[PDB]
Amino acid sequence: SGFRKMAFPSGKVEGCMVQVTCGTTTLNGLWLDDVVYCPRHVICTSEDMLNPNYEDLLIRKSNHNFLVQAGNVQLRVIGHSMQNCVLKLKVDTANPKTPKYKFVRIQPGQTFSVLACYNGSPSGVYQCAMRPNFTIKGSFLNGSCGSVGFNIDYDCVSFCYMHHMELPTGVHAGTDLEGNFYGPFVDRQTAQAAGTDTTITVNVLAWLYAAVINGDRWFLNRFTTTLNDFNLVAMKYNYEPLTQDHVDILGPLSAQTGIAVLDMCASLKELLQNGMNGRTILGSALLEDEFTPFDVVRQCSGVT
Amino acid sequence: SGFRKMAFPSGKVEGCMVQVTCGTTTLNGLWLDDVVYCPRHVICTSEDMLNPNYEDLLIRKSNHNFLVQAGNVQLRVIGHSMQNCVLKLKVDTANPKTPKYKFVRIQPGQTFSVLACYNGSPSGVYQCAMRPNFTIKGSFLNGSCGSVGFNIDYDCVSFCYMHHMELPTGVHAGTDLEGNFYGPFVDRQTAQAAGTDTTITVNVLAWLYAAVINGDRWFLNRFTTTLNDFNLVAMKYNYEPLTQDHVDILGPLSAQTGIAVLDMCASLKELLQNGMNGRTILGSALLEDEFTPFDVVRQCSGVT
């Protein structure tokens, strides 16, 4: 029993982190096979970041200008290319600790673990969600760029995120491992405002199911609702519309608890309309939306 | 910027987890040097757990009755002893992945990372605090016993916790790595009620400092207080008494933010008396007490 904001074990990703230095800029790289992936803004002076022309900046860089250190051993850079907003540094040594891996582009509402790194060294691991506005709410200081987000499926690391930017509002923007930003963000120090940070309704419902499974039941009510009725209330509270796809995804939690998804929707409707009245659910005074239905099943069943 | 409930990177501890089986009971062990540490209740049938005589139960066990598997390779058990509530299984092979390590007994209010494991396989990592009543609020299913709690200081793992028990209230009890329970708990399936789960005041204050550092300032007020005045309010709200030792420990956060500890105490006093009025602090609607002053400094400075 008990339900915790749980990250994937980070060892497999720890073995992939390196330091990348170009001129005076140091950040993190991801070493898989004989390629090191890092944010292309490694080539920028903070001055460059105001209006960088990356293709022009990159012309002035050679293989020997990219200093790649794995622990306290230097890797030899034999090639470099830009793919979207990431640099791929070809090295002469395959990472001997390369796990089975994939690159995946996640959807908003999907959760992942971040291994926060500085100078290629892991400092910590925490669980995130891709927000509906394609930001994440991370913990990233200067030097943390190139820190990665991931999921693990048994022995296969799916990399979904590389850290690039903090917006002036202190929220975070990055890319997939093909270097494509999540959302409309660019690797330039300019005005970039995030859109509405809506609540991930399907994740809230998953977490309410987690609460019931774990003995927190005070919020279960005598009501039901419809998708359309619930959605009128979701809209008012800046919750994402709930779709039949979401209801289908919650089916196994519905089944396990014997609470129909639309009944749990009606419980969530009353919580939105009435608030918590100073009560808590799984040690939270707000409705948690950074657990997916898959997360709740995994944690409640003990998948390794 | 941003402040997250962050666990230590778990790789060093992942390399230490093994499976221990005795008869039909399987749980986790910690492999350091040529010793595997596991809960002594590995020798119990669920029947035994009602009133176990561990010395008597252990007489019927030989080295070959303890099956220890590290990945899918069996370790040869050449000795076994009971120390308090843990078994030490001597194996013929030193763990080649043994990190630098210490065994530490933590105080209530101290935080640590848990690597939740099943069948010697890591499922997840999360951050805990030793509660003032010497419980932890974990996420542990059947098979999770022998999962460990730890802190990392650069390259040295300090092991502070081994998981043993869930109380009927769904909170968790375990030992240090010398096998001494935290608090008054015993490895017996009997009535064991936890005492008052008080709030770790010094950790709340640390987290309020983290909030200010991260731009969340709405709760800073025009007031100050005294330790004695604050403590009258702490008592009423089941907060731990604040001591001059706590004020001294908060000194670096006081210094960095320029907010006197007793001024932050007066902000916390108003939050207790007035509540949050539907506002949040670092994405929480309650006062977070599972960050130590050391945690806040580490995260806010980016220690690896």
Side-chain angles (χ1 to χ4, degrees):
Chain A
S1 201
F3 203 76
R4 273 283 187 179
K5 190 68 69 55
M6 192 173 270
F8 291 98
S10 59
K12 282 178 199 301
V13 178
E14 289 170 56
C16 298
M17 302 309 312
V18 298
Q19 185 190 70
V20 185
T21 301
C22 190
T24 58
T25 303
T26 297
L27 44 58
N28 304 286
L30 186 75
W31 184 23
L32 304 169
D33 300 328
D34 58 351
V35 183
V36 174
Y37 303 82
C38 74
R40 66 173 175 172
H41 80 232
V42 74
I43 71 177
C44 295
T45 76
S46 64
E47 314 82 284
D48 291 329
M49 280 308 288
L50 297 171
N51 192 25
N53 187 311
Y54 283 101
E55 279 289 12
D56 288 346
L57 290 182
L58 194 52
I59 288 168
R60 308 295 149 201
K61 299 302 176 187
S62 300
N63 290 338
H64 67 264
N65 292 131
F66 299 98
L67 304 170
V68 180
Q69 199 178 318
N72 281 357
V73 64
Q74 210 71 20
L75 303 179
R76 187 181 299 281
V77 178
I78 62 171
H80 65 275
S81 55
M82 185 165 58
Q83 182 178 10
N84 300 310
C85 296
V86 292
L87 294 176
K88 297 195 306 224
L89 308 175
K90 200 196 190 184
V91 285
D92 72 348
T93 306
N95 182 354
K97 298 185 200 166
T98 306
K100 299 186 205 187
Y101 72 88
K102 302 186 154 158
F103 294 165
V104 303
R105 194 180 173 79
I106 57 163
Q107 297 298 334
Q110 291 312 110
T111 60
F112 59 88
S113 299
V114 174
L115 182 63
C117 296
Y118 300 89
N119 301 117
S121 289
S123 46
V125 67
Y126 51 92
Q127 193 65 0
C128 277
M130 185 51 59
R131 298 314 307 177
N133 64 4
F134 296 103
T135 66
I136 73 172
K137 293 185 188 122
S139 178
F140 295 113
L141 301 169
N142 284 357
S144 68
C145 303
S147 301
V148 296
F150 61 97
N151 287 277
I152 310 185
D153 190 2
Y154 176 50
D155 64 352
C156 185
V157 183
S158 295
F159 295 101
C160 51
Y161 182 86
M162 182 170 269
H163 187 47
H164 289 238
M165 306 289 288
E166 186 167 80
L167 303 187
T169 57
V171 306
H172 300 119
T175 69
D176 63 22
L177 267 294
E178 300 176 344
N180 291 126
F181 267 89
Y182 290 101
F185 303 118
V186 295
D187 45 358
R188 178 177 175 206
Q189 184 189 329
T190 180
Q192 309 188 64
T196 308
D197 199 358
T198 61
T199 302
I200 309 149
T201 314
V202 65
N203 292 6
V204 174
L205 284 169
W207 169 86
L208 289 176
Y209 279 110
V212 171
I213 293 167
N214 286 285
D216 280 354
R217 318 207 143 111
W218 64 258
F219 58 85
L220 295 179
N221 59 30
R222 299 176 161 282
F223 317 143
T224 200
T225 184
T226 67
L227 266 188
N228 291 163
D229 177 61
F230 175 80
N231 280 336
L232 291 183
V233 173
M235 162 104 65
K236 154 143 156 138
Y237 288 93
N238 286 147
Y239 269 62
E240 290 291 282
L242 197 68
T243 72
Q244 185 62 41
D245 281 11
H246 296 138
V247 173
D248 294 347
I249 281 160
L250 288 166
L253 289 177
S254 181
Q256 195 199 316
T257 62
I259 299 167
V261 174
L262 286 181
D263 296 0
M264 191 68 86
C265 288
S267 286
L268 173 55
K269 165 167 158 195
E270 296 304 302
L271 283 171
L272 292 180
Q273 288 181 331
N274 293 324
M276 310 271 289
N277 281 113
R279 296 185 279 270
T280 62
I281 300 171
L282 289 175
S284 176
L286 54 73
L287 308 175
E288 294 290 317
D289 83 341
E290 293 198 352
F291 299 96
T292 69
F294 297 110
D295 292 336
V296 168
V297 166
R298 177 177 322 101
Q299 184 163 167
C300 288
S301 83
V303 179
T304 59
Chain B
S1 201
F3 203 76
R4 273 283 187 179
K5 190 68 69 55
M6 192 173 270
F8 291 98
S10 59
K12 282 178 199 301
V13 178
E14 289 170 56
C16 298
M17 302 309 312
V18 298
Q19 185 190 70
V20 185
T21 301
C22 190
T24 58
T25 303
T26 297
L27 44 58
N28 304 286
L30 186 75
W31 184 23
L32 304 169
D33 300 328
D34 58 351
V35 183
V36 174
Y37 303 82
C38 74
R40 66 173 175 172
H41 80 232
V42 74
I43 71 177
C44 295
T45 76
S46 64
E47 314 82 284
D48 291 329
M49 280 308 288
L50 297 171
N51 192 25
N53 187 311
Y54 283 101
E55 279 289 12
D56 288 346
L57 290 182
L58 194 52
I59 288 168
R60 308 295 149 201
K61 299 302 176 187
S62 300
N63 290 338
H64 67 264
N65 292 131
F66 299 98
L67 304 170
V68 180
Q69 199 178 318
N72 281 357
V73 64
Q74 210 71 20
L75 303 179
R76 187 181 299 281
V77 178
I78 62 171
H80 65 275
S81 55
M82 185 165 58
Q83 182 178 10
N84 300 310
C85 296
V86 292
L87 294 176
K88 297 195 306 224
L89 308 175
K90 200 196 190 184
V91 285
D92 72 348
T93 306
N95 182 354
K97 298 185 200 166
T98 306
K100 299 186 205 187
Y101 72 88
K102 302 186 154 158
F103 294 165
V104 303
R105 194 180 173 79
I106 57 163
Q107 297 298 334
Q110 291 312 110
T111 60
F112 59 88
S113 299
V114 174
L115 182 63
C117 296
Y118 300 89
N119 301 117
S121 289
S123 46
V125 67
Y126 51 92
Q127 193 65 0
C128 277
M130 185 51 59
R131 298 314 307 177
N133 64 4
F134 296 103
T135 66
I136 73 172
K137 293 185 188 122
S139 178
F140 295 113
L141 301 169
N142 284 357
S144 68
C145 303
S147 301
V148 296
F150 61 97
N151 287 277
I152 310 185
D153 190 2
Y154 176 50
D155 64 352
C156 185
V157 183
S158 295
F159 295 101
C160 51
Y161 182 86
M162 182 170 269
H163 187 47
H164 289 238
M165 306 289 288
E166 186 167 80
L167 303 187
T169 57
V171 306
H172 300 119
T175 69
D176 63 22
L177 267 294
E178 300 176 344
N180 291 126
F181 267 89
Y182 290 101
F185 303 118
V186 295
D187 45 358
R188 178 177 175 206
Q189 184 189 329
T190 180
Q192 309 188 64
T196 308
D197 199 358
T198 61
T199 302
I200 309 149
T201 314
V202 65
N203 292 6
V204 174
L205 284 169
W207 169 86
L208 289 176
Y209 279 110
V212 171
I213 293 167
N214 286 285
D216 280 354
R217 318 207 143 111
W218 64 258
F219 58 85
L220 295 179
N221 59 30
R222 299 176 161 282
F223 317 143
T224 200
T225 184
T226 67
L227 266 188
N228 291 163
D229 177 61
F230 175 80
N231 280 336
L232 291 183
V233 173
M235 162 104 65
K236 154 143 156 138
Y237 288 93
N238 286 147
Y239 269 62
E240 290 291 282
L242 197 68
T243 72
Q244 185 62 41
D245 281 11
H246 296 138
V247 173
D248 294 347
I249 281 160
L250 288 166
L253 289 177
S254 181
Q256 195 199 316
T257 62
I259 299 167
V261 174
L262 286 181
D263 296 0
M264 191 68 86
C265 288
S267 286
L268 173 55
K269 165 167 158 195
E270 296 304 302
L271 283 171
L272 292 180
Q273 288 181 331
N274 293 324
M276 310 271 289
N277 281 113
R279 296 185 279 270
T280 62
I281 300 171
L282 289 175
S284 176
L286 54 73
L287 308 175
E288 294 290 317
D289 83 341
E290 293 198 352
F291 299 96
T292 69
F294 297 110
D295 292 336
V296 168
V297 166
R298 177 177 322 101
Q299 184 163 167
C300 288
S301 83
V303 179
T304 59

